[PDB]
Design an enzyme around this catalytic site. Sequence first.
Site, PDB file in Angstrom:
ATOM      1  CG  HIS A 331      84.081  -2.091  45.020  1.00  0.00           C
ATOM      2  ND1 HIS A 331      83.059  -1.817  45.901  1.00  0.00           N
ATOM      3  CD2 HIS A 331      84.539  -0.893  44.590  1.00  0.00           C
ATOM      4  CE1 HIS A 331      82.901  -0.513  46.005  1.00  0.00           C
ATOM      5  NE2 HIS A 331      83.787   0.072  45.221  1.00  0.00           N
ATOM      6  CG  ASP A 387      82.008  -4.339  47.999  1.00  0.00           C
ATOM      7  OD1 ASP A 387      83.249  -4.549  47.921  1.00  0.00           O
ATOM      8  OD2 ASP A 387      81.386  -3.448  47.379  1.00  0.00           O
ATOM      9  CB  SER A 493      83.959   3.928  46.063  1.00  0.00           C
ATOM     10  OG  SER A 493      83.208   2.946  45.416  1.00  0.00           O
TER      11      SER A 493
END
EC number: 3.4.21.5
Length: 550
Positions: A331, A387, A493
């Site tokens: 992502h 992901d 992230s």
Amino acid sequence: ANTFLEEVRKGNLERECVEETCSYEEAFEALESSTATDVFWAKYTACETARTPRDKLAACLEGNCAEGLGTNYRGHVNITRSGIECQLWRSRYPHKPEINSTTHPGADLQENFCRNPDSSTMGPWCYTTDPTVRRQECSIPVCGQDQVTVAMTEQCVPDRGQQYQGRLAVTTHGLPCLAWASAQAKALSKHQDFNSAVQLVENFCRNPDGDEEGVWCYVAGKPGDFGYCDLNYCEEAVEEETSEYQTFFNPRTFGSGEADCGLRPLFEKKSLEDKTERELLESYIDGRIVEGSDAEIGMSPWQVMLFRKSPQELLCGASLISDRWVLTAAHCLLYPPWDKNFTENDLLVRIGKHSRTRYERNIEKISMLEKIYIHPRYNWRENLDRDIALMKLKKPVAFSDYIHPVCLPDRETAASLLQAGYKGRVTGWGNLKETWTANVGKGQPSVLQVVNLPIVERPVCKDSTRIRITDNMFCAGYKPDEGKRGDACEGDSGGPFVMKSPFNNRWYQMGIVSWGEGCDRDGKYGFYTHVFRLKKWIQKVIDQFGEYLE
Ligand SMILES: *[C@@H]1O[C@H](CO)[C@@H](O[C@@H]2O[C@H](CO)[C@@H](O)[C@H](O)[C@H]2NC(C)=O)[C@H](O)[C@H]1NC(C)=O
Ligand SMILES: *[C@@H]1O[C@H](CO)[C@@H](O[C@@H]2O[C@H](CO)[C@@H](O)[C@H](O)[C@H]2NC(C)=O)[C@H](O)[C@H]1NC(C)=O
Ligand SMILES: *[C@@H]1O[C@H](CO)[C@@H](O)[C@H](O)[C@H]1NC(C)=O
Ligand SMILES: [Mg+2]
Ligand SMILES: [Mg+2]
Ligand SMILES: [Mg+2]
Ligand SMILES: [Mg+2]
Ligand SMILES: [Mg+2]
Ligand SMILES: [Mg+2]
């Protein structure tokens, strides 16, 4: 049975044929019917290897259990080992049989009951109502034994598809598999350690290389491209599966670093603990919370930062697994709901950093990206499934006291680490929270942070949300307080979640930090994508890159 005459003939069969051996004719004189006698004789022939003692034979003849290959079997099992409903032998939908009453008249091919007309080595079987699986064996009790022919699974595929014999021939992206026997496909299987038990039929999805992700096939495009196929694998939560360091990859392609992974120059190599190793037991202070804090310098030397080149801007964390490969979240690179699709030349990475805000010319290093590989199962429409992404550095990076790679665990290691009584650890510069929320109050940290989080039981983590947790995710964090947001949105992230082996003393990346409800809502745990299934994907990616060279 039933008729008196029949009950007499039953007793005679017992006397002359079961308690004693009999001839066909002796048998006929007793049943006084060619059909009945042929029916009996086919069983008697199927029970050739089980004629004594008498009860062994009686059981075999009753046909409710399989003896040997189970040509004797006459029971009413309807379903395949994996739970698929058997097709009627008399039907041609979805498969058109090749074996029928006429080709195999003494096999008792009725309704959709499992039978073994062809003396197949897997035992009794049936054509399936699944159009993608022609035939499959059934789980039948063995005669005279607390045992079955083949293990049952509850409507799902076992062993990550390594028993799969079906004909699914597209990947999860709808890409047609290529034929295994095609020239380019053979050229790539050339010297792979392919398990010869897996049959590479046509262009059907297979798992010949023991890939923990499951079945796959090559697909058209760049030589070596491939994709995974959608099968319903059994839920196998590695959390609950019951020394040394051995290297998995080839240094010529992986690059340097694996042999020495997970041992930090400034800590393990100097025989010094970092400040919070001491608090890593789940039992530490009764398991009560311990807040994050400034990291020591070089206590996470695999930490990587991913930056936009222009405008200069910190995007994501990431982790160093060799001198040229880096692991992050897809992502970070491709996320259509934010209109995000970054290419190689939009980005750079910075390795060996401590301060978020400063160029640290003595310690940090800047690398460009050669290639990005988004995981072929990545799906953002669902729930950020898989992901995961891999990035290749344009030039390998220099190791130092501040730049050193982390280990990657296999399945055995992963189960072992989630189950020793130690917490995991997230480090970074609060980029998850900064990316995904307004982040008011408490600014971003200027210095690398660390916090340690205990793994959460899967059923508890499941009850913390209405989201379906696949077995490829896990939770970690302290008992939440539904009044407070807690610290369930820590790290960067795409950054690493790691754990230290109490067996070989090395740090392993267990997770990749992903978005979770913790970022928005009280009462949550942090949310991490498992990495333990990735090794064979990685191995295949690094060959795909071998081809990239011309
Ligand atoms: C079982 O298979 C046999 C063998 O193919 C089928 O018999 C053939 O059927 C075609 C017509 O579709 C005939 O033209 C052939 O003469 C038959 N061959 C033989 C050797 O008999 C049979 O019809 C199939 N039976 C069932 C119940 O499907
Ligand atoms: C992300 O954007 C890149 C760059 O715009 C896209 O790359 C294109 O790929 C297609 C198909 O191979 C080509 O027709 C174009 O020529 C490529 N563009 C450039 C500038 O090289 C890529 O398709 C995008 N990815 C996704 C998933 O949408
Ligand atoms: C087998 O199939 C029948 C008919 O299709 C079904 O209704 C029944 O539940 C099944 N029987 C057994 C013994 O599993
Ligand atoms: Mg008797
Ligand atoms: Mg007799
Ligand atoms: Mg006798
Ligand atoms: Mg006679
Ligand atoms: Mg006689
Ligand atoms: Mg008689």
